[PDB]
Design a binder for this molecule. Structure first.
Ligand SMILES: *[C@@H]1O[C@H](CO)[C@@H](O)[C@H](O)[C@H]1NC(C)=O
Lengths: 50, 108
């Protein structure tokens, strides 16, 4: 598998037309105090096709 | 007055714009910056571009991923504040940069 191609699975809001946003800050769906790591309903925003 | 910064956090966590004028050129760049806050000291890589009597006027707006700049220069007799009258800003430049801006700051 080639993991050098990624897509963002989560963001706090939808992109506007031609908006670009590469910052990998953790997405929180639970009440979790994640502070920059994966956890209970708390997610690293990028995933790969492999 | 020598430039402006635009973005959300302005520093580290996101892309932000830098505009600088040094009288020899205008330098324009877009990075996850941690840059100098005072270009008077002169006396990541997502985009880059280069090119009281004076009232200098500008308009900045971001639409569909393009950052528009318009401008005008005029001499003014009463330097006290923005002089009553009319004069329209011509376009300058239209940067294809795609960034979310919520905040800005001026550079002295
Ligand atoms: C731009 O970023 C801010 C957070 O810094 C956010 O509140 C805002 O919703 C973003 N813009 C859009 C269209 O989501």
């Amino acid at each position: 598998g080639n993991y050098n191609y990624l897509y963002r699975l989560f963001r706090k809001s939808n992109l506007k037309p031609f908006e670009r946003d590469i910052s990998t800050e953790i997405y929180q769906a639970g009440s979790t105090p994640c502070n920059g790591v994966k956890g209970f309903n708390c997610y690293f925003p990028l995933q790969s096709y492999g | 007055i020598r430039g402006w910064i635009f973005g959300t956090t302005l520093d580290s966590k996101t892309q932000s714009l830098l505009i600088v004028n040094n009288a020899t050129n205008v330098v324009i760049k877009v990075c996850e910056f941690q840059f100098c806050n005072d270009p008077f000291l002169g006396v990541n890589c997502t985009f880059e571009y280069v090119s009281f009597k004076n009232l200098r006027e500008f308009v900045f707006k971001n639409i569909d991923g393009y950052f528009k700049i318009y401008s005008k220069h005029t001499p003014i007799n009463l330097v006290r504040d923005l002089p009553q009258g009319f004069s329209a800003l011509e376009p300058l430049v239209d940067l294809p940069i795609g960034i979310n801006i919520t905040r800005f700051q001026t550079l002295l």
